[PDB]
Enzyme design. Structure first.
Site, mmCIF file in Angstrom:
data_model
loop_
_atom_site.group_PDB
_atom_site.id
_atom_site.type_symbol
_atom_site.label_atom_id
_atom_site.label_comp_id
_atom_site.label_asym_id
_atom_site.label_seq_id
_atom_site.Cartn_x
_atom_site.Cartn_y
_atom_site.Cartn_z
ATOM 1 N N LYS E 199 0.845 -1.169 0.000
ATOM 2 C CA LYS E 199 0.000 0.000 0.000
ATOM 3 C C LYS E 199 0.894 1.236 0.000
ATOM 4 O O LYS E 199 1.709 1.405 0.906
ATOM 5 C CB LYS E 199 -0.933 0.009 1.221
ATOM 6 C CG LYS E 199 -1.748 1.262 1.310
ATOM 7 C CD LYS E 199 -2.744 1.182 2.436
ATOM 8 C CE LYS E 199 -3.514 2.434 2.537
ATOM 9 N NZ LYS E 199 -4.728 2.338 3.432
ATOM 10 N N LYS E 254 -2.419 -1.456 -3.490
ATOM 11 C CA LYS E 254 -3.202 -0.218 -3.453
ATOM 12 C C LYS E 254 -2.281 0.968 -3.560
ATOM 13 O O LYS E 254 -1.260 1.024 -2.883
ATOM 14 C CB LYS E 254 -3.925 -0.145 -2.141
ATOM 15 C CG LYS E 254 -4.808 1.061 -1.986
ATOM 16 C CD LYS E 254 -5.509 1.195 -0.620
ATOM 17 C CE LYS E 254 -6.363 2.384 -0.359
ATOM 18 N NZ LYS E 254 -6.767 2.466 1.065
HETATM 19 ZN ZN LIG Z 1 -6.544 3.553 7.366
#
Ligand SMILES: [Zn+2]
Ligand SMILES: [K+]
Ligand SMILES: [K+]
Ligand SMILES: [K+]
Ligand SMILES: [K+]
Ligand SMILES: [K+]
Ligand SMILES: [K+]
Ligand SMILES: [Mg+2]
Ligand SMILES: [Mg+2]
Ligand SMILES: [Mg+2]
Ligand SMILES: [Mg+2]
Ligand SMILES: [Mg+2]
Ligand SMILES: [Mg+2]
Ligand SMILES: [Mg+2]
Ligand SMILES: [Mg+2]
Ligand SMILES: [Mg+2]
Ligand SMILES: [Zn+2]
Ligand SMILES: [Zn+2]
Ligand SMILES: [Zn+2]
Ligand SMILES: [Zn+2]
Ligand SMILES: [Zn+2]
Lengths: 329, 323, 329, 323, 329, 323
Positions: E199, E254
């Site tokens: 992420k 992500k």
């Molecule tokens: Zn968060």
């Protein structure tokens, strides 16, 4: 199936713009780490004849020079203490003295320049009367696990001083894991460990031993029972795999240009943050030739670009300031 | 293979000389060494080179004297570089293919006197052009590729005619390996080897060689930044018929050596160039580094995957290896 | 895209100098390990008819011959004791006797030639009345873990005698790890373990069983419940991976030339120090043919070069002295 | 390598800016940037493009004015796209090879005024056909492959004659790279680079470009579903003589960039197309995303393995990089 | 050796039937996960200006809308609570409140639609006054291990509420293992852990921070000491390897389209269930352009097909309903 | 990646339908399906095939009726196999290239009536030879390679002339793909695809097909023992110009499918042959296996890496997929 003359590899070389577009690697200041030799005392500056243009600096003088290194955007320094002869011992206790040169320097720099990275050296060579990297047994052999106990205390002292990175250069087996275990148990969760993973038993270190003052101590001694045989390449992969497993955050090859094949294999095999040290002897060779008028000063950026090309993320180099200055233009 | 301290202690093999010897992965031998020589035009002449301490330019007779010692030490081959007299340089580089040029003379003399010694001639126009560039220049000052190749092919043929076992094109023109190979086959020189300088960089490390031979190249020599490109260079040269392929410079490009060996598994050579020599010898003479760095630098080439090394240290090294 | 006649692979073969330049592998004395059969007693030398030119030697005679092996630069010896029949037992206790032939020989050699490597054999075959490599259960099966307990005591005895390397040739599962654990707990930190990792259930061992004197004991017995099936190659990779994980410093394939494909796969897969044993039967075959005038004596260096080419770092060979002699010229 | 928490905490390198900088794997520089330009026919003219906020079509004189700033910022090259007047379009696309067509004029003007600036011309018929398709149509309305190539080759030659250092065939005809290369070599344009649009997808992301140049393609442009196919496209184009190979669109195909770089290790380019530009700029103008996404999108291309990026953001980015 | 004109890659493109036969990837409804913003209260629906067409919904309204998402065959929802300002704290205690929005929503959905997958978010960002993902130390740094203790309690609360999947989005080191250890010790044997493994510290999240209401809290704060540097690719492989080892059942990248190269490397390297999040900023960009008439609505299925092509198994996308609707035709 | 129970429990994803769906690695769709058809010579005729329960031979008019349902179900293509009347068989196989042969007629009828439906014709002599072998026989009864190819090329051209979008050589002669490709290009059939039966085994699974078409092959079809050999078959066919490559039989060779897909990343097809069909349908009819095995067998092909499947189950499967 690329074949002349459909494929002419000179076409992208024809013009600067195209060479620039296809250029595979660049050096930037973000790649540079400046090693620095630190003296005890105040108002001290000493030229090193075997490293032309490099000076040993007392802490006050270091702080002054660091203003310019910071202004140049050099990310980090690697500190090497020039320990007074009288503070060398069989037990290397000065290594973990909170009032040692490395620990005082760290504290000073961390306060004055909080964004500047400080990489301390974990090794007993500056501290031993015999100049070896660890503690000797009664046969004159560098004991592995007893040495680690001292290295651990050293590393903890550095963390306590505020160093963001400790860099074990000792080549004891297992020391990365032992240091990491210690840092974690003490709460130094974010102290990085920059392992000297593939450090070879090289002739290229001579000038540094002069600069740090361990040359006299070591004499004709060798480090072949711990530093790596120059002949060996596969062995380096095993060394690095262990250090990664043991918790290293960065892994290093030393020396540098004589070992670019090792840098390439290490980067290719592990895809981890990989560092290389352009050692004193490499710096001296290059400087000597430039000063003689045998090589143009462009060799400096050629030498550093080689490291990037070979796969290093970062380079410990005594050329860091000249290079940063050239890059800034 | 889940090797972990303390079950695995990589120091154990390092404990003793005998186990260090057993596991040592590479060794340099005299079989790896090729000595480059700078060859003068008269007789009974040697000249020292300011930027290459300890290396002499040698007239052919002097070369033959020294070659007795080289052969005795087991050095397999020489690479000849002629020091052309200024008066024989020209825009057309015709001296390159003169049958009584220095290289051609030197080759015939050596082939006759030491028939087992390998002779590697240099195919390149740089010792022959008034301007010192490696090929023929157009009006804009650009090195012309295919025009230059025609001269190079004539050069290579003249070397073959002189008895050279190996021709080594160092010019970095595109496609020259194939053109040379085609001309050698068509002429019946079926066994003349071609040692391609395949990945030859636009480097600052060549300064002293230019002092040595008495001779801006980024449009043909490679960008030091580039690694992948070297593999494409090499692939073309193998396809074109090279018997051996070479990386130059050497130490500053050991990564390229390793990639080249690994990718093609072909006979791979490396040039420890004049500037590498000079910086080492300068440092050793200044007392800054131990003599031991010579063999350490040469062992690096072997470790990186080189089969042979062009090195001005070849005689010193051969001597050290014989003790 | 290399194609005739652009590519003619004969061109580098045309002359000795070019064959030398491109030659991929060389044998050197640094590659050689000499196995030696050691007798009890004094002034004893015995010819082995199935290994022409090899003699079993008492320790005093071994010491004499070792002067020449050392002068030749052979790095190490691998000792095999010829145990007296009366010292064979069901429990193999002689294996860990501090006064056994192997332990006495080690001590003698370590004192007389301190730089010479000594590799002891860890295995119960010279010590058992039945000639199997471990201790049997009541069904005649070689018990794995009980055997390891004896092997461990043996290995420790060797370390105590001064051996720099112990080489388990027994093919019990897990024994590398058990021996390593024992060596480490006892403080024998630097004793190397040269695992016989891929040791096959081969017909090529016949002469050695004669030379060590286990042939009579084993009779028609086989070792297929522990030594590897000749047919299996992938299995060797699994064997070696375990031994590396368990702490081996070197891994070995045995026999040798019949298994060069295994040497290649093992070197390629692990890039670790890899050894190969040119067994008694291989030596005999070659000697027999050279003595008959069927093969030239050049086959000896051809056979040894094969091992280097296949990827071995070191070779256990009864030709070690002749080869070292030829190399020295 | 058995890295496990808590011995391995990947956050440690993230703790401080200096260590983030040390380990940062990729950086964007001005050397990576190529600016596409839409070029008009008169004089003293600019036009705004409704679907590309902030991008202007420029007459040649205006181009030359702006190019001074582009060159000053260090942008290495431009890619020109002519905005053909309707009256010059035809079924035969002959305006493509008109020596006084916009592209050809623009190229000569630039080559003269900024000789170091690289000029990449577009080889494609889409700005020239009455119908806007990328080649010549048959009676069924299919784009004819080999007939179209003949026009394309004439176009490319006209660009070479105008001084273009790079021609970039964006047409997606089969075999066009080889045909162009053959014609350039045969004409003596030995150093004109060909930048193949190798993996060019039949994408919805091109809508705004069609608005910009004033110009259904699934029989030649690639199916967005297909990845392996891109490798076969690229391989053919390298074999055919491309000097550089390109993926288009860009962000939506970063996987293809990575595979292409990894498989061939050749000079690899990526086009951040008009629709990518528009959606970013629209979002930034709407206040929905920070300006920082520009450099984040460009860094993605570098990370994915691109050597250079065709991007309408090139000037903004170059400006940001110069601060 | 494929070469024009023997090989013309246009031939399979000539006709729809052949393009269909050779088409390498398809999107199906089985690939879609719909993220949803959940409000406290009853009868609440709120438009998000920076995410046109997306509404924040109270639980009763969510249940109504879910009938259609279920009818469309969407496999799962990912819930994001819009925590009331007054329930934000330094300790993030609301994260593990059994009466929190996420836990109430889970219970409601699990009862009403038992076959629908519920993926809860494990992260402290909706709960902290400062908007960071964990608990801060006295230097303002997000403490790793203290944060994990809160994350663990959160995760357990979700499991207790009936969530079939918990998805840690926090980027603390080691949290996958800690959560898994907790789930196993508590008997939540089959609760899946969908790790946000790679992420990145991205600019593309702006709209989501608005939608969940953490934008005001975070202000100008950044997450660079935990979320990944956009520049780094190899690092993602290390991140994912750890999470797999720690017990993740699925791994996620992500943001999405800006990171498709990461999706490809992760799928290729681990061959594990791989997910990708098409974040708020990606949705906004696309919507903005479609609404302006700059891009045709066909870009939605192009964007989603990209994820499949890059190797994702599943896609978290705010387009999930429109896409499912288009697919259903 | 050190995944270990109980931190890793691979059952968790299996717990629920939704998570099974999320992680499911492959799906069969109608886009994957190609239906082989046996085509008779008259009018208003169907025949049942004893060894292929449920499959009918169809006269062209009947084919056209059924094709409406096939097209409605979304099946992309058909593969036609003519049932030649005995009186038209010969030693020379000339009926193979008769413009009013069944295949040619069927193709024109279909191309006109359903222009979007793909038509794959069979290039092989086995329906045309008095003896049923796949090529022309010499005096020793050996199938002549290059002589057979000449007939095959004429056949393929006749199919192209009839409007076939794809020709699929199933003959296993060496080099036929290249010969066919060369003849199609030379004739202007630039877009006619060639679907090579590349790895076609000498199998017992074909028995029922021979019953179906009304038609010892180990000198041309592959030894079932051989896997590596299939990769060499495929490589040649790609180099020769195949647009798609096929493995036959299917299920018994799923390993070959996987290796072929993995090695070449090219459009890969698989034939679920008559005997596979028959054993499945026989078992389902006997009540020994559930109908579900049909989709399980087809999903296996997708999982193994096939892009498309020639299958007598195509209509059943398409029906199941539409529910
Ligand atoms: Zn968060
Ligand atoms: K860096
Ligand atoms: K050599
Ligand atoms: K060795
Ligand atoms: K670039
Ligand atoms: K999926
Ligand atoms: K398909
Ligand atoms: Mg180590
Ligand atoms: Mg004289
Ligand atoms: Mg070249
Ligand atoms: Mg074993
Ligand atoms: Mg004006
Ligand atoms: Mg193409
Ligand atoms: Mg993580
Ligand atoms: Mg009817
Ligand atoms: Mg074939
Ligand atoms: Zn040290
Ligand atoms: Zn030259
Ligand atoms: Zn034994
Ligand atoms: Zn176009
Ligand atoms: Zn047939």
């Amino acid at each position: 199936n690329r074949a002349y003359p459909y494929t002419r590899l000179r076409r992208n070389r024809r013009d600067d713009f195209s060479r620039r577009l296809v250029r595979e690697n660049v050096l930037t200041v973000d790649d540079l780490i400046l090693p620095v030799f630190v003296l005890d005392g105040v108002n001290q500056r000493e030229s090193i004849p075997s490293m032309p243009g490099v000076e040993r600096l007392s802490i006050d003088q270091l702080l002054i020079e660091a203003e310019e290194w910071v202004a140049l955007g050099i990310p980090a320094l690697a500190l090497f203490p020039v320990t007074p002869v009288e503070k060398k011992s069989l037990d290397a206790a000065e290594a973990y003295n909170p009032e040692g040169i490395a620990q005082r320097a760290t504290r000073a720099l961390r306060e004055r320049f909080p964004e500047l990275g400080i990489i301390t050296d974990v090794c007993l060579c500056p501290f031993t009367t015999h100049g070896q990297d660890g503690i000797l047994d009664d046969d004159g052999y560098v004991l592995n696990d007893v040495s680690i106990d001292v290295l651990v205390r050293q590393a903890l002292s550095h963390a306590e001083a505020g160093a963001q990175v400790v860099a074990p250069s000792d080549m004891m087996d297992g020391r990365i894991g032992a240091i990491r275990e210690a840092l974690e148990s003490a709460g130094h969760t974010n102290v990085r460990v920059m392992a000297y993973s593939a450090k070879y038993a090289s002739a290229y270190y001579g000038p540094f031993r002069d600069a740090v003052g361990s040359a006299s101590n070591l004499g004709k001694g060798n480090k072949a029972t711990y530093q790596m045989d120059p002949a060996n390449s596969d062995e380096a992969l095993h060394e690095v795999a262990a250090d990664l497993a043991e918790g290293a955050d960065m892994v290093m090859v030393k020396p540098g240009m004589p070992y670019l094949d090792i840098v390439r294999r290490v980067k290719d095999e592990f895809r981890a943050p990989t560092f290389v040290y352009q050692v004193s002897g490499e710096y001296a060779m290059h400087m000597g030739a430039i000063q003689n008028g045998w090589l143009a000063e462009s060799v400096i950026l050629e030498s550093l670009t080689a490291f990037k090309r070979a796969g290093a993320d970062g380079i410990l180099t005594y050329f860091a300031k000249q290079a940063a200055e050239q890059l800034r233009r």
